[PDB]
Amino acid sequence: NKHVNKVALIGAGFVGSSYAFALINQGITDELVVIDVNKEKAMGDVMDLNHGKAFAPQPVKTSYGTYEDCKDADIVCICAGANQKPGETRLELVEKNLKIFKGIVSEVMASGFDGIFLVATNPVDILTYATWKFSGLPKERVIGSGTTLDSARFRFMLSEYFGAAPQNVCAHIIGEHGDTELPVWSHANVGGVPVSELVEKNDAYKQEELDQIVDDVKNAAYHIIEKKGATYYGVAMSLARITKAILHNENSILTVSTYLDGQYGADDVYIGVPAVVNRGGIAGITELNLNEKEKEQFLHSAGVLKNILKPHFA
Amino acid sequence: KHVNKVALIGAGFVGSSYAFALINQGITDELVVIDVNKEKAMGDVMDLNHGKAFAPQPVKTSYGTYEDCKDADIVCICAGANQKPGETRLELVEKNLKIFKGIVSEVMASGFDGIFLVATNPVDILTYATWKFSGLPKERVIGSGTTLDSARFRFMLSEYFGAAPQNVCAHIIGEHGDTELPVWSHANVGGVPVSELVEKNDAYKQEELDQIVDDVKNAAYHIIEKKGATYYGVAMSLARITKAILHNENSILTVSTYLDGQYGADDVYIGVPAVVNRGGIAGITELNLNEKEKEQFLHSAGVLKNILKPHF
Amino acid sequence: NKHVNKVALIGAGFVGSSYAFALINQGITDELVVIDVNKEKAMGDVMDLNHGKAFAPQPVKTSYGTYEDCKDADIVCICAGANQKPGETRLELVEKNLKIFKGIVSEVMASGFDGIFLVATNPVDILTYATWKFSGLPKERVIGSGTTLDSARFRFMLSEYFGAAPQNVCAHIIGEHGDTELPVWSHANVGGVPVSELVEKNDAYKQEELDQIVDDVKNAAYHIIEKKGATYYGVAMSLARITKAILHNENSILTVSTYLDGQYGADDVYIGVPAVVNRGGIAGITELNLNEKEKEQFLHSAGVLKNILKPHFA
Amino acid sequence: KHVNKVALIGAGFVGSSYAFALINQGITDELVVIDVNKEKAMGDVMDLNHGKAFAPQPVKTSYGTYEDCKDADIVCICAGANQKPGETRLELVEKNLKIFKGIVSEVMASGFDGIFLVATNPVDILTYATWKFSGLPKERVIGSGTTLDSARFRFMLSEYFGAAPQNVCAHIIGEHGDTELPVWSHANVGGVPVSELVEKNDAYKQEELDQIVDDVKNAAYHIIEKKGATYYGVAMSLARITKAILHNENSILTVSTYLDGQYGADDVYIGVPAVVNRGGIAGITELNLNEKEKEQFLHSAGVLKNILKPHF
Ligand SMILES: NC(=O)c1ccc[n+]([C@@H]2O[C@H](COP(=O)([O-])OP(=O)(O)OC[C@H]3O[C@@H](n4cnc5c(N)ncnc54)[C@H](O)[C@@H]3O)[C@@H](O)[C@H]2O)c1
Ligand SMILES: NC(=O)c1ccc[n+]([C@@H]2O[C@H](COP(=O)([O-])OP(=O)(O)OC[C@H]3O[C@@H](n4cnc5c(N)ncnc54)[C@H](O)[C@@H]3O)[C@@H](O)[C@H]2O)c1
């Protein structure tokens, strides 16, 4: 791991495998190790992914292994966990996933691992916080997927809408990855021009075309799930994106799950805010000056997370 | 300005992975997904579009129907019949021929005339069939052939001899399947034939190169044995072929090609090194097969043509 | 024309050649034709550029030609012109370059050309305006390099200074390519956080560090010219960047020279403002809401350009 | 995490273009520029940094002195003696040996322990010299050799026979200059030897591809007639060699390599296909030269050794 990057992936279901396929198709990592007690499916996938390695932009070494093989990984990405049953509450789900994560994080730490954790399993902000507690690592080195997917979709939708490149559009979705996440309209700007100005100086641009764009961003997963049974291509891409910012030391600003410590008036909680991501993990936290409405929405969002953490952590 | 468009027929494991590979690689400008099961196709398009903002190149992906093929540069067929694990029907090829008959008809009816790319098995048979059912020139119906197997082979050897695959020549030709064969006579690392390296060294034993071939030929069976299906590797090969087409690469690939007595066989689609570009097959490179290989090849071409007439 | 991009370059000196080398190294165009009456130097460069085409990321066809060879070009890039002699005024330089451009533009129009003009020669805003008048093309299809290079250097300094990726930093330099160009501080933001906030809520972030970053951006060319004798690598890169936004239809926002009639209170002048650039040229003009100071700086900048145009145009 | 670093010695036409090519291609992480003419090097670093925001990859470029070579992975030498119009002096090799002597001792004295990449002419001679003055392992001193000329060749041949250069083997070996020679015996397209294509057709004939070789050998002289110097092509070849090193490619390239009787030559640096990776030269491809090529090659190696002895 001096001239080569390695990723250990824990959990080879739909998300995990699509994530692996993405890393390979994009040439993001040099080595990938897949860890999953379901050995036949996971070795099947590893073998399938090696089958076509000749066509990838860069050669990727893919293997089946276990926790000991994490020793030299730069990143461990956890996609393992039970899935939210209908009629089950999130606290009931969290109780199951905390037990699973306790074993995983424990074993990874004992292998000698000294990299970054990247958490994908739901509820992600909760499990990111737990991985921090269980691991003993600095909070900068435990990262969750946060609202990254929703943000990027929000930012692209708008980019199509006002007609600039995404690189030029500023739009963040922040808060808990879920229903209480909020748009930061007060700071949304096309090519530097605040959205509110673009709207008022125009009736080709109207708020409802915008307030529904938000409602569609928040329901995207539910509609995918309704038509196909599950969602995983989007999540895979968002994880590949985060992995790339880390392995290639990009200092990209992404709304990953980040530990807050007083900023935005929130304490002792992992939550989606814009943060600079590099080879060391979290390099810095962007502190947007929220307007009064957003500040209340956000503290509420941080609140629903603390309500879930409180029964499980002191 | 030309906008590259692909239409995909069949959003199963192979079709879906193929799509995801195009999106991750930035290979096409537009992609349309068509499936008899409309809800799966709709759902898949939504999932693929969910992470659209993370794709390296913008790609317009949409749900479509047969008429949306009209202006497609390429139509990729990944649809096919399910196994009935009972009726092993060494045929059942009949099931698929009927599917392809109906499918090809609908796309021709839409006004399409770009290129077909066939992935379903048995790929050589169904490629021949697609040509027949479509009435397009032979250079514009293409099957995945043995491209995957040749590519494993070639790379698996750049490891063995220690060069970039870029510098290591090696093909696998014949029917995609059991009767396929390596072209040892033209295998060379750097500008240096394999047999030369075999004798003039024993870090390069001559049985170690032999076993590598068995790996390549059985790789798919082993994946199927564990997971139930292969898709990631296939999807990669398809995306590669699509890339040589859409970007006019003129790159040499052992795709399923129509033969005109060129390897002592004709009236058959079969795996052979063909040059691939925007017009489709642009040439067939003709290897000087040694006698062992001519035997293997014509036996392989025979096996295929055999299963053919009964339906043509 | 339909499956391939072509660039015609007029003028094969330091800028033009470096630009060509840049297009080739970056794989931006499929075809390049070089046009210059200095036949030996220009065929020399074409031959030199072709000598190593095998190592370029993409195969690129380079040739020596003349105006007739512009018929099927997507872009014509003009780098030809006299160079500003010591003790010569800009109005004296413009008199020379207007005569030269009159011949060049006339000849390329008569060849059948129907693409975009990209103008590099100094004074760039003046010659971009002239090329518009001489060509009869829509104003969206005549583009100058503008403050594009200074802007991007400005937006890289700050990127290294506040520690985020460039794609996350917003900072424009606008106005005349030259001494009256101004920073738009009022809209400079990191991750969406105005620079003025960042200065206050910290003092690892003082003002002068900022004002000097500007003074150094304005003088960069002069210092290169002191030590090296001439400047051309940066200019070439900025041109390749603009060319890429056009040939690949990016909708990138770039401070190219753009025709204003009314925007920012300026009429009938080409000047550097942020504009969306795509395959059709200028797609839209970002209208920043300048503060009192900036608005005055900008109209002064538009003013020194009109002072130069007025003797030459109605 | 390792940061790739390149030190460049000589910011003239070739050095400057090499730098701009590294920046445009995103090949290294850091680059230092060293020149006796301090002002020129400062100015160039400044010009190269001017457009830094536009580089595809971040690259730290700095002005430097010989001590800055300590951490350098690669040291590239593009410095050399001026023509002198006066005495044509088939020597002046003397002028340049004195330059390299001083340059190499200065870098070694910094703690440098990476790879040398030599570009100045006559490249083969100066590569030999650099290996002497440095005392490094021979696998860590590399000359540009005939990489450029082979790559042109390989390319003109992908046009002529109509394939992607990726599958069109053809080398040019020997001294970089007049006595260099094409290896027709292993020239092949898609697996098929050139001679097979020449006789088996008249769309292809052995005077067509006889002149392709003369164009290749004389290209540089023609550029020099017109413009005074070549740099763009050379800079491209250097950046390519630098890329195979820094990115551990195991690319086969006809760089200047030290020979151990390997082609009947010994104690000489000369152009042959060698595998290039992060450790430098990792192997030497042993082509089975026909008798004509053996003659040319050993004659080529003779010419070189002969220029060497008076300085041995
Ligand atoms: N390794 C393998 O993936 C495997 C193994 C043996 C055979 N095959 C053959 O290859 C085909 C593709 O493999 P897969 O794993 O993606 O199968 P799959 O079952 O996952 O998907 C096949 C898709 O084709 C679609 N389809 C069927 N008839 C259609 C029609 N007439 N028009 C449009 N779409 C139609 C189905 O809806 C399905 O989505 C299989 O159907 C099978 O015939 C595949
Ligand atoms: N086609 C060609 O470019 C060409 C033609 C004939 C000979 N050459 C040889 O190759 C060399 C490089 O080619 P070029 O075209 O860039 O020449 P160039 O004159 O443009 O650059 C040579 C650079 O080397 C520098 N230099 C000289 N001695 C040095 C030393 N002791 N330490 C550090 N730097 C030193 C010079 O200051 C100069 O900047 C030439 O000097 C010449 O010997 C090149």
The residue behind tokens 């139930």 is B228
Residue C194: closest CA among A199, A288, A255: A288
Distance of CA B133 to the CA centre of its chain: 19
- In angstroms, the CA A151 to CA A256 distance is 10
The answer to whether B275 touches D163, Cβ cutoff 8 Å, is: yes
Residues facing residue C76 across a β-bridge: C8, C117
Please identify which of the residues D2, D171, D176, D186 carries the catalytic annotation.
D176
Selection from D247, C163, C201 nearest residue A280 by Cα: C163
Grouping H, G, I as helix, E, B as strand and the rest as coil, residue C74 is coil
Q: Name the one residue in this structure whose structure tokens are 């000056």.
A: A289
Closest atom of ligand 2 to D95 CA is: 43
**Separation of alpha carbons B181 and B213, rounded Å:** 9
- What is the nearest CA distance from A126 to chain B, expressed in angstroms? 23
Q: Which amino acid type is present at position B84? A: K
Strand order across the beta sheet in which C169-170 lies: C169-170, C189-190, C193-194
Q: Residue A229 has what DSSP assignment?
A: S
Task: Name the nearest CA neighbour of A76 among A172, A9, A2.
Answer: A9
B193 bridge partner residues: B188
Q: Give whole-number Cα distances, D180 to B261, D183, D214, D216, D217, in Å.
A: 41, 10, 11, 10, 8
How many whole angstroms from D86 Cα to the centroid of ligand 2? Answer: 17
Helices D13-25 and D232-246 meet at what angle, rounded to 10?
50
Residues of A identified as active-site: 177
Please, what is the angle between helix D291-308 and helix D123-134, to 10°? 60
Q: Which residues make beta-bridge pairs with A182? A: A174
Structure tokens that stand for D184 in this block: 């027709």
Sheet holding B188-189, edge to edge: B168-169, B188-189, B192-193
Contact B43, B63 (CB under 8 A): no
- The answer to whether the bond into D122 is cis (omega within 30° of 0) is yes
Tell me the C-alpha distance between B94 and B310, whole Å: 10
User: Considering only CA atoms, which of A283, A100, A24 is closest in space to residue A108?
Assistant: A100
CB A246 within 8 A of CB A116: yes
DSSP state of D231: -
C-alpha span between D27 and D246 (Å, rounded) = 8
Judged by CB atoms closer than 8 Å, whether chains meet at B248 and C279 is answered as no
Three-state DSSP state, A95: helix
For residue C147, the number of C-alpha atoms closer than 13 Å in the C-beta half-sphere is 30
Domains annotated on chain C, with CATH: 1-146 (3.40.50.720), 147-312 (3.90.110.10)
3-state DSSP assignment of residue C312: coil
Cα A255 to the chain's mean position, in Å?
Answer: 8
The answer to whether the CB atoms of B226 and A49 lie below 8 A apart is no
SS3 A278: strand
The separation between the first and the last C-alpha atoms of chain A, rounded to the nearest angstrom, is 37
DSSP states along B97-152: HHHHHHHHHHHHHHT--SEEEE-SSSHHHHHHHHHHHH---GGGEEE-TTHHHHHH
CA distance A167 to A188: 13
Q: Which residue has the tokens 């047969």?
A: B66
What are C173's two structure tokens? Answer: 């330099």
Ligand 2 is surrounded, with C-beta below 6 A, by: D 9-15, 34-37, 40, 78-81, 96, 99, 102-103, 120-121, 229-231
Look up residue B145 and give its two tokens.
Answer: 């052939």
For residue B247, the chain C residue with the least C-alpha distance is C3
Q: How far is the CA of B297 from the centre of ligand 1 (A)?
A: 29
How many Å apart are CA B137 and CA C225, to the nearest integer? 62
**Among candidate residues C24, C11, C27, the one with its CA nearest the CA of residue C50:** C24
Nearest Cα to Cα of residue A258 among A243, A236, A277: A277
- In angstroms, the CA B100 to CA B134 distance is 10
- Written as one letter, the residue type at B172 is I
Rounded (10°) CA dihedral C111, C114, C116, C119 = 20
Minimal-distance CA residue to ligand 1 atom 40:
B80
d(CA C288, CA C172): 10
Q: Which atom of ligand 1 is nearest to the CA of B37?
A: 37
Nearest CA to ligand 2 atom 5: D229
At D303, list the tokens. Answer: 């010419």
Residue D162 contacts residue B281 (beta carbons within 8 Å): no
In angstroms, the CA A178 to CA A222 distance is 11
Q: How many CB atoms lie within 10 A of CB C259?
A: 23
